[model samples]
Target: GLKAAQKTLFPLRSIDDVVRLFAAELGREEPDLVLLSLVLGFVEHFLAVNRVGLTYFPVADLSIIAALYARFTAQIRGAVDLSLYPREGGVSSRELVKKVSDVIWNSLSRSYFKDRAHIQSLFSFITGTKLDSSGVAFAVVGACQALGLRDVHLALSEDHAWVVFGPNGEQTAEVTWHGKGNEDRRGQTVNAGVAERSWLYLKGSYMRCDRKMEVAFMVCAINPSIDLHTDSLELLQLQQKLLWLLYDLGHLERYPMALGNLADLEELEPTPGRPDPLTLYHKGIASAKTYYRDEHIYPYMYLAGYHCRNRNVREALQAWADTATVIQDYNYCREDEEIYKEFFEVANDVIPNLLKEAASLLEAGSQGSALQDPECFAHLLRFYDGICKWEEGSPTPVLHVGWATFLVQSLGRFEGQVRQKVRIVSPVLTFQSEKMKGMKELLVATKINSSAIKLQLTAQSQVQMK
Candidate 1:
């Protein structure tokens, strides 16, 4: 039945045909991840040039698609040399994964921007030997599947991905590189960092995808940006259509990031009959809470970012506070630079800019000012409070003098009455100095005795006295 269905999927005459193929593949009892990944790459590449032509008429190059299919089969069968190590027990052998990873790693071009469009699929591997970090991991899983390793699947975190295998999916391995200049840990089991409760590891709450969910992951990785300023509408449509197809198939239920991706596209092009962006955002948050033990941060970040962009300042502050609460559960690791920058930007840039907007609205005599909202102030403190708790019990320090200055500046915007209206119940910080508050206590613990904070606090006290 699978073969019979796949027979009509050939030529992929149009994007709709591709969608049919994806739907059919996903509908099967056990979808072939390898074929789906390759077909996706093949279709995405052709869609770029054929653009409008495909909608009107078939630009289907059957030879290109067939060759791609054959190339992947040939490479995995030949390049990997699977005969050397036979599978033992239920999981794939470490040597087999290492050999496969090596094949993918060695083929990569000398240097390229690791995070970009068009690099995560088999098309990039076939055409240019280009694979991003997660792409390499995906490829390893796909390669394993090609080699008939049915148990292997992708394990995804907010910032990284790896493979898990064995009868119960108990075994793990780092089949790809992570972060800049980090030593390749290919073939090693995922343990040490997880034990450390590193945010990169997510403490074992990362999404472990079945074949269908992995397909969702691949679709989520598709980049619509043709350039910085412009995007290919054709690509966007294809990705959106495919995502909705997957959504209909119930593949997105537990995939918070995928839900967020779909919500993001829906935000750009409102798909009628589909849930609105805000609904999709909350769905993502709910998905994270239900499936990911509320450890994932992007769902909340997505919601907060949307609210902030829409000038829903109070809601944004609360969403970010929620995000910080999620982050409080994990320790910061060097490999987690991406998330670190996310919080850093929110603290130094987004929240400050939002505050400026709120303050201006207040100066314009707006009745309901976020600056005067004690709950908003409370949310702000909770936001920083979570980050402080995150920094606690971690070897790496999160806050410094700059963060302290931002805290003082942010607090100064709210009057004493507003600050006094909010009371912190059972504060996490027990400061050695009574003058030290939430973020300042964090700085003081880090031995950052910066006068900038002292001067700011002194100025605020004098202003109050005046």
Candidate 2:
């Protein structure tokens, strides 16, 4: 039934018939300019015998119409984008692809997809490669090479991608995506009511666990610290350029190298005509400028962790300000522990050294603070007891480990004999310091709890100020 259907719409008998029909339907005016040496310039020598065409391979990349067939089509194992292919010029690259595709079809394929009616169904997934989300980038690339055409690649923001060839630099693409998207936004402060649509906007934004500043701080959908980790951070950013290079004569040779892969393209712009899909995909080129902008240390927020991971800087302060920053005492919403904690351990506290560590990590002569660092009060009390035999003498930071341990022990409930093997005493030598009155009420409320906080020491840094 499948074969019957394919035959109904296509010239199923030969590649020659299909190409001719495809070209005919592609009827264009001024053919010479349209395909600019697309065929005759370079590859005339590709093979006097080589007449290029497409490989009917099942790949992730496809036209919408063709994608229809994928529901039942078989898949195959493909190599990573090959390098210096058809380089072994002789029979020519066109002929090489033809032969290789045949070999793959005949020898390299199998019942990679099953679950069909005892292999009776039209297609199956691949054992070696069902769907790599990231497989088979270019078919037209191989064909374009033999035919001498700059292939039209169409993958952008993601599967909803499109494109054309351009030397447009990332700078231009940025302009294309969000035209100077930020206001002359200066002289702002971080607060709950600052940003509108985007929390990542380079302007200002703030959220917190406290409820006193009802308008300035509201309980969000989740802990602001944990929300970005769980919610979506891909609001405006583009997806990674998955369908990139060509599997032709290595990357060195001229082939369909998609714009998404190349870092720079000096002159790509809108040409009124078929200006190329990259025109739309320029969405990725410059990137979400405001999204990454430092709106109240947004990148460093407990909310912007995903972006930091994409950049993958483990240290929280380094993640927020650029690498040239210095730090002393800074409290990460949850420091170097995001995905790692999700997999290995149940959620637990991440100890931080604030005053010195946060300040020391600040970049020397950085463009001052964009917004006052928000208030981060961690209630810690000096405890006089709790020590483990595991560390009688040899130890370092967690130094004064016993002092902090008593506070940790008093806060959370212990599980399955955890406290017996390791002693966790209550806060005995306790004192709370601040410039204002919340402490008296805060103290009246939590007599049994302790919170570890490390903060930037400033005249404004006193805990009672918030």
Candidate 3:
């Protein structure tokens, strides 16, 4: 009776039906990575077709996925000999992985919008001979799977993806292109970037995906926005449904960005009986801290943005301070301009907006004025303090005259009484297991040079009193 019932739903008429099938596919001990990815891509593409009274029922051709899978697998089998790169000491040779990378790289169409929507999927690759940077890397991992190489896996950073393999997943290779006019450095090791402490590499905090985690990345890659200001609601709903399924199954535990993506969607449209956006956001931050060595910046930034939107100024300031502390570990390079812009918005736009609002509250004689809060002033100093620490040992300068102007104007708003309460403390020497691993050295009080600012504020306040 159950088999008969399942036969009737084979065509998959609804989003829930699709979710159920995905759940089943992912539930397998060794899931077909290529099949699942192509299926998801197929479903996403079909959902985007422009029409009226046209729904997802009796879903479009599954045969196309099978045919596409056949082609990719056949090409891998034809071009490469897996025997030569046999697993010695439980790891395949690097050459095998590099050759798979070559297949995907050479298969790509000459050029297209590498960052465009929907192209980061295998369905896009086979249909258009095109793949985004991430898509190419994903293809390498999946192609390796096609050749029965279970060891290869996708390695991800904030802005890029690659593949890693070998014993204990120690080996790494660049399987994709990144940034404009950059050299095609495919099949190269990632150690150079990590050693340089590049923000692009996250200083060795990149996510190394197992097959299930790769499923999370595929779900993470789903793009719902149809334009700058508009989105396909149906596609958005499908993505949310799939993410919740994955999250419920605990596949998202180590994937902070997937959690962040779901949090962002929940913020836009709350899912009844599910955790609120704030709860999801905190989970994402915790995931980053516990699993990714607290190397991800977006989770903290997402929380900061949420607090700013809700006018939770105290928490927002702390989050920004936390963000600055996270960035302090990376040496900024030209590849890190996006992160620089993120800081620029916070330093110039968001903090300025908060200060202006705090000023009006103080002028109106509000009892709990942010300007009157000593810890608020402390948070601001800690925020700037971490940024200055980030500048230390960084080749490129992190601050400029504009940053100086912001800092000066911001400190101008705080009264001398509030500024006087801030205490910059030196680190206390401690012996513990965590300490033996070398805890981050807290800045000494002298490094901030806040006494000069305090003196200037004291003189101004004394003049006002007279």
Candidate 4:
């Protein structure tokens, strides 16, 4: 019956017929009308889902509206300014928003009345007001009396507001509120208060509306750490200030203060019926702290441990292990492919050689001499320095670039000892193949601690000459 009635008003038997009808109504050429209608239809459908409300006011004076339509149409593709009217006089954006609220109320109220009684009820609920159900029913019935649908029943469901407009009217269009407070009456009222307070705060003086601050305040208001008498609004403000301070401290890399603020926020008890902001704030704080601890502080501590070990190996080993624990605990995986490859290469090729060299020095009863050896110490320092530079948040090198330079110099300084034992191979010459092809050759020409060593090396041949 509804379809039959609609067909009488709009006989959409073909696309061309609908186009002609639109062109005639809009008072434009048929082709232009088709294009305009297509665009309008697309915009209408797009705006239906994404926006809460859309009011068309006069282009000359935005305060005066020609019509107001309230229905969920479609997803929006761009920004839609939903304010009913622009304000007069030079006012702050916040003040202007407040002034327009009244216009929004009036426009929505009138639009709901012309559409359906159920929509009217929804508006009343959203606005925190009571409506006369019997009056609405009477009005609907009176309107339908002449149409012969006076006996038709109207039902309201959770998902949609029903409307009927025929002899036995039963046509429906959905009315959706942008404010989420309409989900449940009680929760809606509480949420409405929260939104109202948030709007007022935004309007007040706080230019930047930090969502984190709002969340913190909401959490504190609901769950106050101190049993000091405070309402939700007051608690919310306090929490906001606290969170703002924490954010400032976090920016400054003040970990202790940031952690302290987070702890304070965590201790807050959310008030019953209020939304908790702790979850979001806590998550943000945790992420920031992890990045700071792992990326900033831990790397420095690792380097410090290496330096301390240079002074005292036993003590340094303990410190290094402690630093490693911190790094591992934070799940600090090497993200740079080059650095990871270097780590693997160092583990497989470099570390074993250094360990073997140390073992050789100890076997030769030169533990003290080797430890005191400037060459040995230099090589060790270079190795550690390379590790620090490579692992300290830079791109990893695919190949060992600095290893040859250190190894060649250290071994070349011992050429005389290689010549003394015929079986002893030249340490610098042994690695002349591909693995150490570019390594600089070292020729002994200086004596250290009154120990004379052969000297015929140039700077160029010190590390890369084969």
Candidate 5:
């Protein structure tokens, strides 16, 4: 029993220095009594909830807490394999906990890990609830409580949050997400790690706290006693920032390329490209594909809006087309359908007046090309202009899919037998949301200052949401 309890306690940095560091985050310059007081403040009043980080249990029962932490430290040490645990439905927080639950059940489960990055990422600190670094850290610290462990330390930062555990006065261990290489979700995984991060905490981190319940949120940015709202607002703000970025196209530009995982290194930066509207648009689309799938409708509009601003009509039109098609099939809830309508609403709002008025081509062009066979019809004139453009006879290859590629496909399918442009595209669009409209209108008319913070308090604050 002595050895087992000892396993949870990590090496403690001196109280003087550790408390000094805690004071720094709170803006106390003197390593005076005030510094030590901050640590006590955190140890006493912090309030992290279990709902987010450890997704499954709304609040982990004390009956299962220590056993869960026992599973984590035990598996990572290779005493037992983490694979034996169930890995399904474990979004970061839930999954992280299940890793232990899986072992408790499977016993014989063996899984191969490509690298430490595998398990490290699996630690699953972040949840959909508190997407910000602070939120994730809060969820993590809360997880320790769920598992009945008391020795955990709350780590925090203005731009980041993570974990470090040790007995109240003993040593500490460093715990956090995988490498924080400026991934799309930075605060959630942004602190630069220790050179020996892979092994440091693994050998000796965590402590068996004798602390009480409220000590929960006393955790903060790389320090104890952190704020629940501060730069903490940035992550949610980070998303809204992108939304407004779409409104002003003059602020950005784009360079197209096929990419995936758009934290392009999935979550990390493939390269720190420019942060203009174009790259953000590019990033947003890939993120929608990577994270949200057909479920997230905003990015579709966000990206299409960006494309239109950049005069990439073909791409913008395609963005709306791709989503509109799914929206037709989704028949999602009224709210989702309303969100989908914005895709075309914005597309129509942004697509070139010329493209929207494509029917006018019947009189706009001459009777010279395939389009000019005027009697043929008006709709195809816009599309007919693209077939090989009677190439300036150069013996070189060209990317011929041309801007007309997807746009034509999108049009023909909806147009059905009708050769009329306006009649064809009009029926495919219909969207309205009474509640959201009044809400956004209010958000707009009243103006949103940086000081504003919106909380959708539907009586749920769990990290993983579910």
Candidate 6:
């Protein structure tokens, strides 16, 4: 029987065997049959419910779907009760049906489930009819409660029961009761005020239910809009690329390449509705400048200035300062107030000390040995150490061999003795002046011996004097 029923309801042939087995378990037609039918119906309904939910995918659509489910359930219950009871026997029955039908039609038309009393009147009219089933009365109440309509009231009649939706608003009818029939010769219209009161109650019930369902369903589904997520990702990517370019420029000594990349990266703009990436990039750039100028470029420039004063090498000093300015401006590190202050302090202290030591060495006729002065040697080491520290602290690159030569030559007039030794210690050193020859030859010999682990080995080592 279940297989036949399944074949009739659904044309698919695949599940026919399962359906036959299912029906056999219910004993063909007793209480088991009813229970089995209900269980199958529930399973079908559950699958249908899931299908509906998937079609709507997003939260807002889910809310609309939930509301439709509630309304459809209410309508089905009402229709079943009307079919089982026949209300056509008396004038009163006809009048009651018309009134109930009007209420249902109007409520559905206006989507007026929000009104409680109108719902109560409709429910009362259905329950009040002379009908055999007490079960139907309980069913009506349960439906009202499920739909959030609590105003409906049920009453008993002879051989049947009928409900009044409270005092009618402005309608009435005369009717005969059958079992112990009672008759009224005249009918009266229910007052409009009473009808209005009934409606107010009805409206409250449905509105509250509708709102609750809306919120619950909305919370379940995933958000559909992609704008927020996409925008955030784009902004983050831009900031990362900008920082990478800036860091490469500052520490790798690739000034030209870093500059080119920075210009290119700066042209990429953020999307219109999204947070701007440039603001963050600019802040990072500013911080990079602060460190580069104060800790790297400025200190190294001061060291160049000290070297110039000690050796009376004005042109060399100016050239180093010019290189410092170029690099500082290139990296956008030139104009910070604090950087200038620190640069000036180091330059003033360091340059004067170099001059004082050089003056004393020359007065003592110790110019040939000045390179060996502890104070001057200490300054050279300190200057190199300072440059290394600044590079560590900031993104600036370490000096190349060529730039180091320019810095050393700018320190003072290189006595040949000092020049020759300077070349031995730092082999890349060279001089443009002939006056430095004799001292350079002497200093070169001195350095070769000093650098030797054994004096005997040093005698065998050939020294080059320019």
369-466: candidate 4 lDDT, tens digit per residue: 43344444333333333333333332323224344444344444343443223221231112212222122222232322121111111112233358
Shift in Å, residue 236, candidate 4: 32
- Candidate-wise lDDT, in order: 0.79, 0.22, 0.76, 0.29, 0.30, 0.30
TM-score, one value per model: 0.89, 0.20, 0.85, 0.18, 0.25, 0.17
Ordered from best to worst lDDT, the candidate numbers read: 1, 3, 6, 5, 4, 2
Candidate 4, backbone clash total: 24
The TM-score that candidate 6 achieves is: 0.17
Give the TM-score ranking, best first. Answer: 1, 3, 5, 2, 4, 6
What lDDT tens digits, residue by residue, belong to model 1 across residues 274-352?
9999999999999998988899999999999899988999999999999988998788877888998999999988998
- Report the lDDT tens digits of candidate 3 across residue range 317-392: 8889789888877887767777888998898889989989978977888777777787877677667666666666
List candidate 4 segments past 4 Å from native. 1-401, 407-466
What digit string (tens of lDDT, one per residue) describes model 6 on residues 42-94? Answer: 22222332235533211222233234334435564555354433433321233
Off by over 4 Å in 5: 1-295, 337-341, 351-466
Question: Which residue pairs does candidate 1 place in steric collision?
Answer: none
- Would you give me the overall lDDT of model 4? 0.29
Best by lDDT: 1
- Of candidate 2, the 10-residue stretch with the lowest lDDT total is 213-222
What is the model-wide C-alpha lDDT for candidate 5? 0.30
* Local error of candidate 1 at residue 160 (angstroms): 0.7
- Candidate 2, residue 178: Cα displacement in angstroms equals 26
